Write a protein that binds this ligand. Structure first.
Ligand SMILES: Cc1cc2c(cc1C)N(C[C@H](O)[C@H](O)[C@H](O)COP(=O)(O)O)c1[nH]c(=O)[nH]c(=O)c1N2
Ligand SMILES: Cc1cc2c(cc1C)N(C[C@H](O)[C@H](O)[C@H](O)COP(=O)(O)O)c1[nH]c(=O)[nH]c(=O)c1N2
Lengths: 219, 219
């Protein structure tokens, strides 16, 4: 191991800047396809994420073809109606007015998976909680999300669809699970605050309400 | 929605630096306690994580008392002893030589949770995949992990426990699930590559093997 310490004041600010300004993008994606060098930098970042027992359970299916995107867009439309039907009156009306994906607008989509059987018969760290491999994959997703923000690339997560239908479309095996569908594209404008707060779905919760000292429910 | 901010070469390099150098810390934690201000910045960064339907399902239990950490350490011991028992021969020997936690060395611990019942009866984006809220919580963790690296704070995830025992120790409710137990503490020494790779458990997988074009298994 080597010497380490807090980043410089400027470096530190940049990190918090990416965390503080990245957004889930749906409708502002620009049309230019991302270059191979850019994609390589993003995947490289996701690959540097931590992983239970250093399992490195992720895979990335790069989707750029119009037909595939349209196919997946259709899978989303199918499931979203079912989703909306779960709400009523104002909310349902509101839910239907929201844009919850940019699958056809974003020139690139990445299906991020978790190979449930990678790592052998037993994987370190997953022995007592079977979901640790999926969690590891989400860590890869957040790293990508942040690096993309720094690159001027917007990212959007779309979790509204029947997984079995996406797996059939991409040919994903039974032993592999889809953790996230990400829509990517350059963006020149962003919402200063979560889009769902701006459109009155839910507001930012007070952080002081979520932190406890030594025991649950104790401030 | 307004003009997006643009990152300079240095700002961007800082983000990648945090991503490429953060480590899962087990044994390099220093004893200097973290300031209240510092902790606040870390939780703030965590709270800026994306969350399905903007559910914001997380809670953070700050643990600093020796008795509590000793109990969690014992819970870890029991769990780790049964984990090792899932391995045999040489692997078992190596598994037993690995340090998989810094519960008693790190001056601070944070039990990160996920309130499964927050967001009401139906949560946007979680309608077709019930694990979306848990994944959201992981995003907050990764944000905290990166921010910590920038502040010169080491962070380690400990997943080897029996959840029920930890919940009992902290008085965590049935409707709340534990996603991660993090050990935090200043560090001035970090490994250059994953400790688990250095110690011969698993090596870094070739990224080229995990990336497919348009369809699974397709190069
Ligand atoms: C696991 C998970 C799953 C989803 C999301 C997030 C996460 C963490 N989000 C994005 C979510 O709605 C979003 O984070 C906030 O509403 C936007 O916050 P920011 O603008 O990203 O800070 C999301 N957004 C969307 O429009 N359609 C979707 O299906 C999903 N699915
Ligand atoms: C969901 C999940 C759960 C755990 C981990 C990670 C993740 C993502 N890791 C850390 C893991 O072993 C480590 O990230 C890799 O071996 C290399 O990490 P870095 O590249 O050094 O961060 C971990 N480490 C450890 O010593 N004890 C543990 O119980 C766990 N649990």
């Amino acid at each position: 191991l080597t010497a380490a310490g807090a980043f410089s004041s400027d470096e530190r600010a940049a990190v918090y800047r990416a965390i503080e300004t990245r957004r889930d993008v749906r409708d502002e994606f620009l049309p230019e396809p991302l270059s191979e060098e850019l994609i390589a930098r993003l995947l490289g970042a996701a690959h540097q994420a931590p992983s239970v027992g250093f399992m490195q359970p992720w895979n990335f299916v790069l989707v750029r073809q119009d037909e595939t995107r349209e196919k997946v867009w259709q899978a989303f439309q199918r499931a979203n109606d079912e989703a909306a039907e779960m709400f009523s009156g104002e909310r349902q009306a509101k839910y239907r007015s929201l844009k919850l994906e940019g699958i056809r607008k974003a020139p690139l989509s990445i299906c991020v998976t978790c190979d449930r059987t990678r790592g052998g018969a037993v994987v370190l760290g997953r022995t007592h909680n079977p979901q640790m491999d999926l969690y590891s994959t989400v860590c890869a997703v957040q790293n990508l999300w942040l690096a993309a923000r720094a690159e001027g690339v917007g990212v959007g997560w779309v979790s509204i669809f029947h997984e079995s239908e996406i797996k059939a479309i991409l040919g994903i095996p039974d032993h592999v699970e889809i953790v996230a569908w990400l829509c990517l594209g350059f963006v020149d404008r962003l919402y200063q605050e979560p889009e769902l707060a701006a459109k009155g779905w839910r507001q930012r919760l007070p952080l002081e309400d979520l932190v406890f000292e030594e025991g649950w429910g104790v401030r």
